[PDB]
C-alpha cells in the first residue's frame, strides 16, 4: 500500500544515473507507481540507465521541440498503459540552455537564438507537455515540473535563471488551464544536485572547487543542511505532489532546498 | 501502513468539530498517527468534541499566553506518551484577534493592547510552542502552523493579516532554530474555512467563498477542511524531508490567479 | 532647474501620442532633459508623432530584433549628441506579443515561434538595449524598462505575462552587469493604460465587447487601488520613470517600482 | 525651486547626527522643504542635534507609546505651521527592539513583553502616526516609513526582523486607509547604516568583535549590491525618502522601495 499505489505516471528527463528524473522514477516505483518513461535523442543509452530502475517501464522517445512527437505522445502513452487507462501524474524534468547562456560566458553575449532554444526546452515545453498529456489524464491528476529558485539573479546560472522565471509563470497558466479538468500543476524548486545539466554551470573548467563552494554556501544557509550528492529528498517531494495528499495545491512552487531560500546569512 | 504510521503528533487548536485542528486530528489518526491533543480554557467541552474523533487521545490544557503551561508542556507530553518516547510532529492551529482588530471596526482604531494580544496568540506563540516541544522532538520531526496569505491587504481581516505576516516571519526563524535538531518548520496557508475564528472576522462568507472559488483553478469549498488537513499531514510525513521555512498553499490555487 | 536638467536620455517605444513613451518623453523634456528618440518600422509616422513633443529631438531607427541596428546604435546616438558625450538614462518602452499568444486565443494554442518573437521583443531586448547603450552611458546613469505585474496569472494577457516574468528576471541580471559601470537598472510596473499594445488583449472584439472589457479592467483596477486608477492618464507612470532617471534614487537597482495606484498591494 | 520646495514635512526619529532621520531632514531642507521635527525622551539632546541641521525647525516631543502625545500631535503641529495649514509629508523613522529580542540573545529566549514593546514602537506606531497626522495632511500627501528587508531570516536581527515583517503588512493597510484622503504610504527598505539602532545587533560585543561583525555585514552587503554599499553613507537612503515625498511617484502606494544597492535582488 504505497503512496502512489496503482497510479500511472509519465516521467520525462532521464539521461544518466544522476538525473533527478531517475531518482523520481526510482522512488515512485518503490511507492507503487506504474511508470511510462520518455527520453530525448539517445534512446539506447537511456534504456541502459532505465534498466537499473527497480521495475520495468515502457520508454517512449520525446523531443519537446518536435511537434510530431508531441502530437503522437498521448496515443503512444495509451499504447504503453493499455486502452481505456489514463495517466494520474506527469513529471516534467527537462531543462537545457546553450553554453553561451551560462557559466563564465557574459550575460549580454548570449545570442537570442540560443536563449530561445533554452526557453523552448526549459519553460515553454512545460505548457507543451501539459497540452499533450492532459487529454489522457484522470480527474484529480497531478503535473509536476522541476524549478531552480530564480527570484534573485545568480552568477553562472544567467539565462537559465531567466528561463526558470518564465517557467514559474507558465506553471500558473498551466494550473489555470488544467484546473478545469481537476488536474493540479506545481513546481518543485530543488537545491543544487550534481547532474549533467548542473555540470553545464562549470562549462570548460576548478570545476570541483566551484561545486564545493556552491554546496557549502547552500548547506550553510539551509537550516537542515543540503547534500548536492543526494537527490532523494527532491524525488520524495515530487512524489508528495503526485500523491493525493495535497489535493488543493496548484499553481505553486514547493521548495525542496533545505530551507536555504528562506535565510540570509 | 498509513502515511503517519507510528508517528506521535501533538495537535493544538480543537474547539469545535469545525476546527481545522479537528480535521487535522481526524485525518492524522486515520493515517496511523498517535495523537496528543491540547485545548484552551474549556477543557470539558473540548473533551466532548475530541470524543468524536476516530480514536482516543490524551488531552492536555494549554493557554499559550500562560508561561506555566508552556514550561510544563514537554513534561506533560512525556507523561502522556511515555518517558523515552518523543514527538514526531507538532501542529500549531491557534489564532485569535480581538474584535477591535477585525471586521468593520476601523483599522486605525484598534488599541495596541488588543493587537498585542492577537499577535501573542497568533504569531509569537508559534515560537513559544516550538521552544516548549523541541526538547522532546525526534530528529527529522516536523512543526506545522496554520497561515492565511497576508501578502496583500484585505477587507475585514485587518490586524489578523498583520499577525499572519508576523507569523510567516516567525516561521523562518523557527525553521532556523529547529533545523539544528533536524526538525522542519512550515506553514500551510489555507483558503477560507467555516470555523469560529473565521466567523469572528465577519452571507458575507458566501461572497468570500464565491470569489475564492472563482479564482481557484480547481475550485474552493469553505465547508470542506479535509484538503487542508491532508496537506498538513503531507508536511508531517517523511515525504518532504528537505522542506523548511516555507509556506505551502492549500487554497485551490486562488493566490496564484488575478481575475 | 528641472528634475532632469542637462541629462541626456534615450527614449524608445513611441508609436502614437498614447504611447507610454510619448508621455515619458513629454514629461522628461518638461523636466529639462535632452532626448534622443528611437522608433520601430514606421519612421515617418513616428517622426510626425515626435513633432508633437514640447521640444525637438533626433529620431533614430531601432528594430530590437535587428542585429545591425543594435550594433550601430551607440555610434548613431553619438552622432546625435556629439562624439564623446554620454547618456545619463535609457528608457525601454518596447513590448509585443502576437495575437496567438495574448487575447482570446487559448493559452495552449500559441506556437513557440510566436511566443519566442514576443519574448525577444518584450524581454530579451531589455538586455540587448542595455548592451548596446552601456558603452556610452555615464557612471551613475539609469536604465528603466516598462513592466506589467506578472506575479499572478491573468486572463487574456497569457504569454505576454510570461514574457514580463522573464523581463523581471532579465532586469536583475542587467542590474548586475550595468552595476560594474555604476549604472542602475529598474522596471516600472504600470497599471493598465489605453495604448496600442494594451488593446492587444481585446484583439478581434466586436461591437460593444471591447469597451465593456476595458471598463471592467479599469473598474477592477480602480477598486483595488487605494488612490484609484485612470487608464486614460499615463502621466503618473511617466513621472515615475523620470523619478528613476533622476539622481534621487541612487541606491536602487534590480527592482520593480509599482506605478499602479497600489492595486497590486490589495486583495478585494 | 527644489524637489520639495514649499512642502511641509514632519520628520520623526532624530536622536543623533548619524540617525537616518537626521539625513532625511538635512536633504529635505536642502531640497526646499519646511520641516517639523519630533523627538523621543531626550528632548534637550535632540534639539542640539537639530541645531546642526541646515535650517531652523520646530521640535515637538513624541513618544509613540504615549496616547496623549499622539492625541495632541496634530494640534501641536498646527501650532508650529499655522492653524489651517497642512502637512505634505510624514516620515516615520522610528524603531526599537529590546536586547532580549535582537543581537546575541537566542531567538527563543525573548519574553513577549519585550517583543510586544518592540512591535509597538517599530510596526504598530506606523499606523498610530498615520492616524494622528492624516487629519492635517494635504490631499495627495505622502507617508514614508523605514524598513529593513525581512523576506528572509537573518542572524542577530531576530525579532526586529519579525517586527519589520509586521511593519510591511501595516504599510499595506495604512495605504488603504490613507488612500481615502488621496495620501500615499510607502516604505524605504535601506541597506545597513551605522546608527544607534543598528548597533543593537552587536549589543555586548567586546574587544574587536563589534568591528569584525560590522565589517562582515558591510562586506557581504557590498558584494551582493551591483552598485555597492557603504554603511557610513546614509545620503542615498535620505534621497530616496525625499523621492517618495515628492510629487514624482504619484501612483505608488502600499509598496516597498529598496535603497540597498540592489543587494536584495542578488544571490552570491
Ligand atoms: N541539478 C540541479 O541542480 C537542479 C536544480 C533545480 C532544478 N533542476 C531542474 O531539474 C530538471 C532535470 O535536470 P537534472 O538536474 O536532472 O539534469 P539532466 O541533464 O540529468 O536532465 C535534463 C534532462 O532534460 C532533457 N532534455 C534536454 N533537451 C530535451 C528535449 N529537447 N526534449 C526532451 N528532453 C530534453 C535531457 O535529455 C535530460 O534528460 C531540469 O529542469 C533542471 O533545470 C536541476
Ligand atoms: N478558518 C479559516 O478561514 C482560516 C484560514 C486560514 C488559516 N486559518 C488558521 O487556522 C488556525 C485554526 O483556526 P480555525 O479556523 O480552525 O478556528 P478555530 O476557532 O476552530 O480555532 C482557533 C483555536 O485557537 C485557540 N486559541 C485561542 N486562544 C488560545 C490561547 N490563548 N491558547 C491556546 N489556544 C488558543 C482556540 O481555543 C481554538 O481552538 C488559526 O491559526 C487560523 O487563523 C483559518
Ligand atoms: N499600456 C499598458 O497597459 C501597459 C502596462 C504595463 C506595461 N506596459 C508596457 O509599456 C511598454 C510600452 O507599451 P505601451 O503600452 O506604451 O504601447 P505602444 O503600442 O504605444 O508601445 C509599444 C512599443 O513597442 C514598440 N516595438 C514593437 N516591436 C518593436 C521592435 N521590434 N523594435 C522596437 N520597438 C518595437 C512599438 O513600435 C511601440 O512603439 C511595453 O513594454 C508594454 O508592455 C504597458
Ligand atoms: N540603520 C540601519 O541599518 C537601518 C536599516 C533599515 C531600516 N532602519 C530603520 O530606520 C529607522 C531609524 O533608525 P536609525 O537606523 O536611523 O536609528 P536611530 O537609533 O538613529 O533611530 C531610531 C529612532 O527611533 C526612535 N524611537 C525609539 N523609541 C521611540 C518611541 N517610543 N517613540 C518615538 N521614537 C522612538 C529613537 O528615539 C530614535 O530616534 C528605524 O525604523 C530602523 O529600524 C535602519
Cα angle A189, A192, A198; round to 5: 110
CB A14 within 8 A of CB A23: no
* Torsion C10-C14-C18-C19 (CA) sign: negative
As a whole number of angstroms, the distance between CA B35 and CA B129 comes to 16
Residue D258 bridge partners (DSSP) = D189
**Resolution in angstrom units:** 1.8
C-alpha dist (Å) from residue D125 to C66, C154, C174: 54, 36, 38
What's the distance, Cα to Cα, between the start and end of chain C in Å? 43
**Is A262's CB within 8 Å of D153's CB?**
yes
C-alpha dist (Å) from residue B128 to B123, B131, C116: 9, 5, 51
Phi-psi region at B39: left, alpha or beta (left = phi > 0; alpha = psi -120 to 50): beta
Count A/C contacts: CB-CB distance under 8 Å.
82
DSSP for A137-193, written as a single string: EEEEEEEEEEE---SSB-TTTHHHHHHHHHHHHHHHHHHHHHHTTT-EEEEEEE---
As a whole number of angstroms, the distance between CA D237 and CA D225 comes to 14
Edge-first strand listing for the sheet containing B8-11: B59-61, B34-39, B8-11, B87-92, B137-147, B184-190, B246-250
As a whole number of angstroms, the distance between CA B203 and CA B217 comes to 23
What's the domain range around D220? 1-268
Quote the crossing angle between the two packed helices B125-133 and B158-179, to the nearest 10°: 30
Q: Cβ–Cβ contacts within 10 Å for residue A255, how many?
A: 26
Q: Cβ–Cβ contacts within 10 Å for residue A72, how many?
A: 16
Give, for D25, the enclosing helix (H) or strand (E). Answer: helix D20-30
DSSP for C161-179, written as a single string: HHHHHHHHHHHHHHHHHHH
Question: For chain B, how are helix, strand and coil distributed in percent, rounded to 5?
Answer: 45, 15, 35
CB contacts, 8 Å: B112 with chain D:
120, 124, 128
Tell which one of C11, C12, C13, C43 to mutate to probe ligand 3, the residue whose CB is within 8 A of the most ligand atoms: C13
As a whole number of angstroms, the distance between CA A36 and CA B132 comes to 47
Atom 40 of ligand 3: nearest residue by CA position: C95
CB contacts, 8 Å: C265 with chain B:
152-153
Place of cell 515583517: D165
**For chain A, which residues lie within 8 Å of any Cβ of chain C, measuring from their own Cβ?**
106-108, 112, 115-116, 119-120, 123-124, 127-128, 130-131, 150, 152-153, 158, 161-166, 168-170, 172-177, 251
Query: A202: which 3 cell numbers?
Result: 562549470
How long is chain C?
268
Q: Cβ–Cβ contacts within 10 Å for residue D8, how many?
A: 22
Q: Pick the closest to residue A234 from A161, A145, A165, A168 (CA basis).
A: A145
As a whole number of angstroms, the distance between CA C184 and CA A35 comes to 50
As a whole number of angstroms, the distance between CA B20 and CA B26 comes to 10
Q: Cβ–Cβ contacts within 10 Å for residue B246, how many?
A: 24
Tell me, rounded to whole angstroms, the distance of Cα A225 from its chain centroid: 22
DSSP for C206-262, written as a single string: -TTHHHHHHHHHHHHHHHH-TT---TT--HHHHHHHHHHHSSS-TT--S-EEEESTT
**C94 CA: nearest ligand 3 atom:** 24
As a whole number of angstroms, the distance between CA D255 and CA A35 comes to 47
- Which of D128, D158, D172 is the closest to B153 by Cβ? D172
Q: What is the CA radius of gyration of chain C?
A: 18
As a whole number of angstroms, the distance between CA D110 and CA D158 comes to 10
Query: HSE (CB half, 13 Å, CA atoms) of D267?
Result: 22
Q: Where are the beta strands (DSSP E) in B101-221?
A: 137-147, 184-190
Query: A42: which 3 cell numbers?
Result: 539517445
D241 Cα: distance to centroid of ligand 4 (angstroms)? 15
Q: Is C65 in the pocket of ligand 3 (CB under 6 A)?
A: yes
CB A8 within 8 A of CB A36: yes
CB A173 within 8 A of CB A127: yes
* Secondary structure, 3-state, B188-232: EEECCCCCHHHHHHCCHHHHHHHHHHHHCCCCCCCCCCHHHHHHH
CB contacts, 8 Å: B259 with chain A:
none
CB contacts, 8 Å: D252 with chain C:
240, 257-259, 262
Residue D145 bridge partners (DSSP) = D92, D187
Hey, is A224 helix, strand or coil? coil
Total domains in the fold of chain C: 1
CB B120 within 8 A of CB B162: no
Tell which one of C15, C62, C154, C197 to mutate to probe ligand 3, the residue whose CB is within 8 A of the most ligand atoms: C197
Q: Which chains touch A (3 or more CB pairs under 8 A)?
A: B, C, D
Strand-strand pairing, D87-92 and D184-190: unpaired
Hey, is A228 helix, strand or coil? coil
Query: Which residues lie below 8 Å from residue D207, measured CB to CB, with a gap of 6+?
Result: none
**Is A119's CB within 8 Å of C120's CB?**
no
Judge residue D194's burial from the number of C-beta atoms within 10 Å of its C-beta, 0-12 exposed, 13-18 middle, 19 or more buried. Answer: middle
**Is B256's CB within 8 Å of C153's CB?**
yes
CB A15 within 8 A of CB A39: yes
Amino acid at each position: 500500500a504505497g503512496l502512489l499505489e496503482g497510479k500511472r505516471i509519465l516521467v520525462t528527463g532521464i539521461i544518466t544515473d544522476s538525473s533527478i528524473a531517475f531518482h523520481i522514477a526510482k522512488v515512485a516505483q518503490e511507492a507503487g507507481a506504474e511508470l511510462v518513461l520518455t527520453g530525448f535523442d539517445r534512446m539506447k543509452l537511456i534504456q541502459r540507465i532505465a534498466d537499473r530502475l527497480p521495475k520495468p517501464a515502457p520508454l517512449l522517445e520525446l523531443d519537446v521541440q518536435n511537434e510530431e512527437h508531441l502530437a503522437s505522445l498521448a496515443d503512444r502513452i495509451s499504447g504503453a498503459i493499455g486502452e481505456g487507462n489514463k495517466l494520474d501524474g506527469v513529471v516534467h524534468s527537462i531543462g537545457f540552455m546553450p553554453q553561451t547562456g551560462m557559466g563564465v560566458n557574459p550575460f549580454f553575449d548570449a545570442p537570442y537564438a540560443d536563449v530561445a532554444k533554452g526557453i523552448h526546452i526549459s519553460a515553454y515545453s512545460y505548457a507543451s507537455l501539459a497540452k499533450a498529456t492532459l487529454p489522457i489524464m484522470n480527474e484529480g491528476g497531478s503535473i509536476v515540473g522541476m524549478d531552480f529558485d530564480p527570484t534573485r539573479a545568480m552568477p553562472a546560472y544567467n539565462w537559465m535563471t531567466v528561463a526558470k522565471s518564465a517557467l514559474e509563470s507558465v506553471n500558473r497558466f498551466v494550473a489555470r488551464e488544467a484546473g478545469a479538468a481537476g488536474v493540479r500543476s506545481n513546481l518543485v524548486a530543488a537545491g543544487p544536485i550534481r547532474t549533467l545539466a548542473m555540470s553545464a554551470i562549470v562549462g570548460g573548467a576548478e570545476a570541483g572547487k566551484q561545486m564545493q563552494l556552491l554546496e557549502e554556501g547552500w548547506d550553510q544557509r539551509a537550516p537542515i543542511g543540503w547534500n548536492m550528492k543526494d537527490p532523494t529528498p527532491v524525488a520524495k517531494t515530487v512524489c508528495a505532489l503526485l500523491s493525493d495528499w495535497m489535493p488543493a495545491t496548484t499553481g505553486t512552487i514547493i521548495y525542496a532546498d533545505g530551507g536555504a531560500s528562506t535565510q540570509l546569512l
